[PDB]
Design a protein around this nucleic acid. Structure first.
Lengths: 113, 97, 91, 229, 123, 57, 98, 229
RNA sequence: CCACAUCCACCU
């Protein structure tokens, strides 16, 4: 889900802009799923070492399954949603091996029929 | 909601999170208190429901109401015509009872 | 499904031949009784409420698990058919 | 008993009669309002033993699809009205009771017309039962039993008389349960849970006793995890 | 003879006696050989009425060659179950698939729970 | 005369057996399908949702 | 109401009067002219398709009635209204798989 | 009696090391499988006590999204790798522990390379923290507390040094839990419940210990209804 | 005994 961008989306250049945009998200300046230039404030605020941590944080109501967030998967940092990560884990547990399950899915698009 | 407030109850926290989630979905206008937000949600015909099995509310509002549901004519059609051995016909011996 | 249908298909040229083999093994297991199995010592089907899968709850699973191992041979003509077919019905 | 009992729910009760009762449990640490409300509600609505009408015998009729002369209502309507009867047992050891009812003349037969019993109370004496116009005789016996849950008429199959007709039983004294968790503030922590659960019952069992039975059942079921193997 | 207890009067089963499948309803003897009407396999309920027509016709006419006939009405109280089907006035057909207990169904913020849940995808 | 032992015996009989389920218009090959029966209480036949398209059911 | 009235399944008062006797199987009503008439009820009549046709009394002893007023219900009428079905609380949401 | 008492649900345990545990409760009466699964799952995911790396301070770190010369991994990677570090305190008296790390030279730095502390233990010494290419200046320290549940780094803001950076704390030892209730069957009736519960834990506490703590917490919270006010 | 004819329905 994406809602609205209310502040200066410029983020690639300024390294001090992280604190300013975090403060803006503290107020009602920018939503968590903001349509920023490079990254949303949701990806900046929450970073998860493992999918288990992301799903546990979802269980606590901090972030929804439809939230953009940075998750450190087996070998890479992915700016995805906990719902997509959970779907990937569902596929990976339905079958035995996880590498094949990871390579036979596309976790960048909604799961249409 | 007047009957609800008669006993001295406000808005449940589960209702609060349901209302904020619906606000993210555009169902209710933002900047309003849970009172009139829930009123506007009621105008849509949708109210907050609780799962009952888990206790947590169903994400997003649920439409509920009163429906006139009637049971249709129910003959032997549902009954299982399951046989293992029965009558056989005269010309051919294919069984039909 | 059933254990290892993929390798069962792999070890046979056609599925129908596999069906014939498994059904003939089942018929042998019935009419001989379950004595001449090649999975007797340890690896046997396990029943839930008791060990009733020792004797004869369903022989198709016996034949399939027996064919999963390498103690079985099947072919168009591997043994003189007349002698074994005359010993099949007259005993 | 302060961080773990005072920053933990005190238990207050607000009950009127023996029909409706609220129980406030405040404060709870975050997440425990539902964790306690849901199992208690399920047990209260599921496995609270009670009393309900089990069998009905009429001196006149011989099956449930007949009618009594002089009676406005059918036998089916009589059974349906009798389903709503609530009976309170005063002796815990008492299991099965047989109430008798004699009726004649132009009388609006209510629930209060049942013959008194030593350890039986009718919590709804104003419940309408039947209507007798003139020269109509209503001689009935109702066998009420104490049970749990919902049981179909044919499942129990109680037959004390040849002409007796079994009826369905709803052994749940609890009419409904509604638990609500609200936000309460403490000095050290601003967000805490206050769990208030409201119980509507039929009067056979006071809500406090129903809550105690539900808590005891949940505790005895939690004890079932104590012995592993 | 053990099952003859329900067959109270001469040949006709008594009113108000519950009958299960395989139970005698009317006892008829042919040339002696037992050819008696029994409850067919399936379901049976409560006998409510029995009518007998004989050759002593007040005003009745019968199929020639038939001396008498008896008809028995058996009533049962069917309740909603999985087999049955329900529908509304708008053509939304449906078949009951599961009967949930009261505790685990969705309920309002109040104590009142919902009665029936309909799949939106049919709309 | 039904008994729990009869039900246990029936469960033991159908441990490995399969039954063929069929829809009245058999348009293609998937109108006949084998299944492993599971004893249930009721009058209707429980069908897996995923085969709701193999049959036109 | 028009459907239940035009289909001769219920009972209606043909003239202004007062009900004399009400039982489960007949209703005796005395009209304004002093003529009393007894209306019997098909208490449990098997239909052509095997259903039950019932006339349930809906008046009390000594109750004044008007011309065309309802006396007994039809097989599928609540109070002079076509009632074949129930009113239930419905939630339009997908449950697990049921 | 097999209806309620003799069917004291067998509690079968299948533990695959100190990480994975399956617990099967069988047979259980209708509707009670969910009633036992939900509160236990919530208790396990919310209130199991444990320890987590609350904060970290590095001498040359001024912002949390900067790059450290001499280390290929950035600060974000460092803190993410520090997230999965599991530490067990030896006595209940510990509340906060500060653990430092000296490291230089082209070597791999792991959890085992932390300076030993007498009263704490590390269950994953081989946890690869980072790499040093050539004389990487690794001067780090981490403060670890004990707590319950999951605490976002933003709200608590626990600080030791001016340039110290908060770290999201995962106090709950259990990685995740999943309960499934499936319709088992007895000899005569089918409407029963079989409750399977799968627990994945970091390794600080075995799944049996976590389940025992959860049921003890639930029982002690149930005992709060005894005294009304 | 269930044959055949006619009619009304249900699922595609």
């Amino acid at each position: 889900r994406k809602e609205k961008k209310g502040a200066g989306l410029e983020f690639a250049t300024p390294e001090e802009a992280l604190a300013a945009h975090e403060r803006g998200e503290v107020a009602l300046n920018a939503p968590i799923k903001v349509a920023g230039r490079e990254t949303s404030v949701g990806r900046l605020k929450y970073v998860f070492a493992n999918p288990d941590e992301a799903l546990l944080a979802v269980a606590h109501g901090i972030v929804d399954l439809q939230d953009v967030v940075t998750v450190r998967y087996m070998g890479k940092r992915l700016e995805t949603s906990p719902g997509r990560i959970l779907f990937a884990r569902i596929v990976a547990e339905a079958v035995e091996d996880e590498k094949v399950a990871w390579e036979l899915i596309q976790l960048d698009v909604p799961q249409e029929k | 909601f007047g009957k609800r407030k008669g006993e001295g109850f406000g808005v449940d926290k589960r209702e609060v999170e349901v209302l904020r989630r619906a606000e993210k979905l555009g169902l209710v206008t933002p900047g309003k208190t849970p009172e009139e937000q829930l009123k506007e949600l009621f105008l849509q015909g949708k109210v907050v429901l609780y799962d009952g099995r888990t206790g947590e509310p169903i994400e997003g509002p649920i439409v509920v109401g009163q429906m006139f549901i009637m049971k249709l004519y129910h003959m032997v059609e549902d009954k299982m015509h399951a046989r293992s051995t029965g009558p056989y016909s005269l010309i051919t011996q294919q069984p039909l009872g | 499904a059933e254990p290892g249908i993929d390798k069962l298909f792999g070890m046979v040229d056609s599925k129908y031949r596999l069906t014939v083999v498994v059904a003939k093994r089942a018929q042998q297991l019935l009419r001989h009784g379950f004595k001449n199995t090649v999975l007797e010592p340890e690896e046997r089907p396990k029943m839930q409420t008791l060990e009733g899968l020792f004797d004869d709850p369903n022989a198709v699973t016996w034949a399939m698990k027996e064919l999963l191992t390498g103690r079985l041979v099947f072919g168009e003509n591997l043994v003189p058919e007349d002698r074994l077919q005359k010993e099949m019905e007259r005993l | 008993m302060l961080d773990s009992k005072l920053k933990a729910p005190v238990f207050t009760v607000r009950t009127q009669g023996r029909e409706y009762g609220e129980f406030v449990l405040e404060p709870l640490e975050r997440g425990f309002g539902v964790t306690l409300g849901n199992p208690l509600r399920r047990i209260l609505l599921s496995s609270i033993p009670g009393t309900a009408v089990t069998s009905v015998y009429i001196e006149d009729v011989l099956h449930e699809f007949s009618t009594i002369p002089g009676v406005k209502e059918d036998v089916v309507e009589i059974i349906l009205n009798l389903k709503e009867l609530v009976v309170r047992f005063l002796n815990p050891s008492l299991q099965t009771v047989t109430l008798l009812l004699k009726a004649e003349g132009p009388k609006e037969v209510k629930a209060r017309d049942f013959l008194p019993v030593a350890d039986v109370e009718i919590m709804n004496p104003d419940l309408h039962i039947a209507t007798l116009e003139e020269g109509g005789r209503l001689n009935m016996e109702v066998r009420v039993d104490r049970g749990v849950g919902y049981v179909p008429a044919e499942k129990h199959g109680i037959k004390d008389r040849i002409n007796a007709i079994p009826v369905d039983a709803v052994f749940s004294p609890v009419r409904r349960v509604a638990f609500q968790v609200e936000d309460t503030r403490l000095g050290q922590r601003t967000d805490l849970d206050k769990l208030t659960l409201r119980i509507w019952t039929d009067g056979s069992v006071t809500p406090l006793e129903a809550l105690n039975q539900a808590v005891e059942i949940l505790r005895e079921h939690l004890t079932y995890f104590s012995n592993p193997q | 003879e053990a099952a003859l207890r329900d067959l109270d009067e001469e040949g006709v089963v008594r009113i108000g006696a519950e009958v299960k499948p395989g139970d005698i309803l009317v006892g008829r003897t042919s040339f002696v050989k037992d050819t008696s009407l029994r409850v067919p396999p399936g379901e049976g309920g409560i006998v409510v009425r029995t009518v007998r027509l004989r050759r002593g016709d007040p005003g009745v006419e019968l199929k020639p060659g038939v001396r008498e006939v008896v008809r028995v009405y058996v009533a049962q109280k069917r309740k909603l179950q999985v087999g049955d089907k329900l529908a509304n006035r708008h053509g939304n057909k449906g078949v009951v698939a599961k009967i949930l207990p009261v505790e685990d169904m969705p309920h309002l913020p109040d104590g009142t729970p919902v009665d029936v849940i309909l799949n939106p995808l049919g709309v | 005369d039904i008994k729990d032992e009869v039900w246990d015996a029936l469960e033991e009989v159908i441990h490995g057996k399969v039954v063929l389920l069929n829809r009245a218009p058999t348009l293609h090959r998937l109108g006949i399908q084998a299944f492993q029966p599971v004893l249930v209480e009721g009058q209707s036949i429980q069908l897996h949702p995923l085969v709701c398209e193999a049959f036109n059911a | 109401e028009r459907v239940v009235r035009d289909s001769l399944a219920a009972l209606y008062a043909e003239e202004d009067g007062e009900v004399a006797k009400v039982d489960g199987n007949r209703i005796v009503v005395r009209y304004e002219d002093g003529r009393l008439v007894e209306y019997p009820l098909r208490r449990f009549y098997r239909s052509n398709q095997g259903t039950a046709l019932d006339q349930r009394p809906r008046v009390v002893v000594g109750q004044r009635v008007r011309k065309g007023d309802l006396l007994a219900d039809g097989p599928a009428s609540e109070n002079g209204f076509l009632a074949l079905g129930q009113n239930v609380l419905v939630a339009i949401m997908p449950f697990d798989g049921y």
